[PDB]
Design a protein around this ligand. Structure first.
Ligand SMILES: *[C@@H]1O[C@H](CO)[C@@H](O)[C@H](O)[C@H]1NC(C)=O
Lengths: 49, 37, 48, 97, 48
């Protein structure tokens, strides 16, 4: 809920982070928006989305 | 079936907003237009 | 640091996987005379 | 009176039924949506740079080596806006009339 | 592809006596292994 200079695996940027409801399948780790931008990520230490 | 008009954001239009593209509200609302009509 | 490298026509390939890299060891080592990158800058190798 | 009332009734019965009537308005809206969708989608181009993602350049390259890649993205994106704002202007002359 | 080999898979129930089913469904990724060899032929194995 805070604005932050994020990074995940090397997915750098700046943004507000939030807990997703999206059901990823076990193999998935990024999601992408209609833009071809990321919009969701699995955290590489604790496997919430 | 309008793809947004600026009615309170708090999908094409999430991407638009995140790239500084914003739909602005019109001066006269659909109610005021209906009133002039 | 292997004892022997390979003939270039038959250039050996070794995988690197499920490990943590520290590119500062290499990027700080005086022993190289060429250390050029071609899709990244070397200061970022620890950051990625 | 009855003919006028019957005719107003036929406009209702028409507009309720048919899927082709408001094409004149709908085509204006459809282009506004599509031109914004196009202007979004141009952000995914390379313009010959090493990525369409701005941060995948900056987090990979140093200052000097970034300036080539970033100048390529400005050369693309900025033309992408002038194109849209031309299209929008011209479109605006269609709507102003 | 270019130094990598990968297998996707799907499993579903159906009731067709001698045919491959009418419909639509997708195969999810299961492994990747960097074999990096020319591959030109294959053969299936089955038990008695
Ligand atoms: C792999 O085999 C094919 C078929 O014989 C051949 O054309 C190709 O050149 C081979 N690849 C290498 C790297 O030798």
């Amino acid at each position: 809920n805070k604005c932050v200079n994020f990074n995940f695996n090397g997915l750098t940027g700046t943004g507000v982070l939030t807990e997703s409801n999206k059901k990823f399948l076990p193999f998935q780790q990024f999601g992408r928006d209609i833009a071809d931008t990321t919009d969701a990520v699995r955290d590489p230490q604790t496997l919430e989305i | 079936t309008l793809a947004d008009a600026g009615f309170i954001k708090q999908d094409l239009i999430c991407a638009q907003k995140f790239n500084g593209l914003t739909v602005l509200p019109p001066l006269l609302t659909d109610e005021m237009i209906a009133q002039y009509t | 640091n292997a004892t022997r490298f390979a003939s270039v026509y038959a250039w050996n390939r070794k995988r690197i996987s499920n490990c943590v890299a520290d590119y500062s060891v290499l990027y700080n080592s005086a022993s190289f005379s060429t250390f050029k990158c071609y899709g990244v800058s070397p200061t970022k190798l620890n950051d990625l | 009176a009855n003919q006028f009332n019957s005719a107003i009734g036929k406009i209702q019965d028409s507009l309720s039924s048919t899927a082709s009537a408001l094409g004149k308005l709908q085509n204006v809206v459809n282009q506004n949506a599509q031109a914004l969708n196009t202007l979004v989608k141009q952000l995914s181009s390379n313009f010959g740079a090493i990525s369409s993602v701005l941060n995948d350049i900056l987090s990979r390259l140093d200052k000097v080596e970034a300036e080539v890649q970033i100048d390529r993205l400005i050369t693309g994106r900025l033309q992408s806006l002038q194109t849209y704002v031309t299209q929008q202007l011209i479109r605006a002359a269609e709507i102003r009339a | 592809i270019d130094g990598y080999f990968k297998i996707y898979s799907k499993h579903t129930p159906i009731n067709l006596v001698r045919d491959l089913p009418q419909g639509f469904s997708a195969l999810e990724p299961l492994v990747d292994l960097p074999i990096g060899i020319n591959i030109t032929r294959f053969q299936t194995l089955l038990a008695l």
